């Protein structure tokens, strides 16, 4: 499923992401935009052989099991395919663990390079939340 900007903002908010660990909603919507372009089915393979899954591009080396990443840790205890569902619950639950890992949202390279220090508020402007 390809989410709309305000649609995603609302789903993320309902799932407890607005201000989770100090990160306003705009940060999460901006990160989703650049990581997957709001597409739940996005996947991208990395050079180390791992793969990123879903709307938030969660990595198979540490967070989910895809059955093809030797040494994967599967910290979210879920098969990576669960992250590609139209229901964003698993992606959100796993992201909560990732952002709490100590490095905050810096764990997402697109957030760090394209959202961090920007007016992220623009991402939820005009939405009924």
Curated annotation (Swiss-Prot):
Catalytic reaction list: Hydrolysis of (1->4)-beta-linkages between N-acetylmuramic acid and N-acetyl-D-glucosamine residues in a peptidoglycan and between N-acetyl-D-glucosamine residues in chitodextrins
Q: What is its main location?
A: secreted
Class in the EC hierarchy, top level: hydrolase
Q: Where is the C-type lysozyme domain?
A: 1-129
Q: Which SUPFAM superfamilies match?
A: Lysozyme-like
Q: List the disulfide bonds.
A: 6-127, 30-115, 64-80, 76-94
Q: Which UniProt keywords apply?
A: Allergen, Antimicrobial, Bacteriolytic enzyme, Disulfide bond, Glycosidase, Hydrolase, Secreted, Signal
Where is the catalytic site? 35, 52
Relate the protein's function as given in its record: Lysozymes have primarily a bacteriolytic function; those in tissues and body fluids are associated with the monocyte-macrophage system and enhance the activity of immunoagents. Has bacteriolytic activity against M.luteus.
Subunit text: Monomer.
One further remark on this entry is: Lysozyme C is capable of both hydrolysis and transglycosylation; it also shows a slight esterase activity. It acts rapidly on both peptide-substituted and unsubstituted peptidoglycan, and slowly on chitin oligosaccharides.
UniProt-recorded name of the protein: Lysozyme C
Q: What gene, per UniProt, encodes this protein?
A: LYZ
